[PDB]
Design a protein around this ligand. Sequence first.
Ligand code: U1H
Ligand code: U1H
Length: 330
Amino acid sequence: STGSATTTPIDSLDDAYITPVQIGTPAQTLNLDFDTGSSDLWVFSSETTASEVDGQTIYTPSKSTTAKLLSGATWSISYGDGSSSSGDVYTDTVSVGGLTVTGQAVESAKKVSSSFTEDSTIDGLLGLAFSTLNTVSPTQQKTFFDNAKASLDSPVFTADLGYHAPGTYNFGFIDTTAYTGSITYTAVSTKQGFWEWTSTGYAVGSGTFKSTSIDGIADTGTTLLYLPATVVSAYWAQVSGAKSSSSVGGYVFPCSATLPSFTFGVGSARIVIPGDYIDFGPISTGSSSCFGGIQSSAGIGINIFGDVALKAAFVVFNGATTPTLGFASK
Ligand SMILES: NCc1ccc(C(F)(F)F)cc1
Ligand SMILES: NCc1ccc(C(F)(F)F)cc1
């Protein structure tokens, strides 16, 4: 079997991407944030504290003939940005773009942090990291991908995120019409539960490529590109007037500047991020200082190839018994 679904940016800055997902019988369609950096499928629901819901579409298990409460199971998650949510667990039928999984753990939010309440466009998250990170207790649950793996034609999914435009998540097949050239595959470590890999170096604009190993995770659920302080300083040094701002919390630059591209290495291949992808606009309405899409990972503890980097490529998440990541230009 295969599945294919369109994913759409939630705003004009590509801060996140939502993908419609059918849950329950009859279908309740929710727009979820597909997150390869986490492993919980959780939704706003009829159980969510009413004051904490502001425009989101909610899942109502009581209206689904296939929903079953998972007795005694709870979940609680904290994300690297300080957001958090928690609740109880149902099993139900979940379909993504024609691909159906029965008995998927659907985690019903009873409490969500303020950042989720304020994001009216995101109805929940669909985790696509490895199932060892799932937070359901006392019985850990599998991700949608892990549950679908056996019935997929190929145990893969692909992310084709658009720049200010819709894109595609495919499950079970690789669309050879969606990229140019060849796909370069690189080894993945699952030891931390992430799609963790090693980039072979970088270049700024038309500069010399610096060969150097950068270990990081491929994370569709993170907006920006977080890299070591040395790399990030080398990039922003090429932008006139750019500086790291403690009050703002990262590098900013004059909105009138033109940004250089950023290249990162995948084995012997190169993925080029156009400079326009790194512009995240004014720090406040009307400001002439703009926020940069490449920031330091120093305070985070791990390097993160977020949407800024991934949307410049066609990305294969190969969930074979030895997992790999594939990158191609597009
Ligand atoms: N997108 C999920 C996510 C968020 C944060 C992190 C961090 F901060 F731990 F790296 C990993 C994964
Ligand atoms: N990295 C996971 C994640 C994804 C989205 C959000 C947001 F945008 F809803 F705040 C927070 C955390």
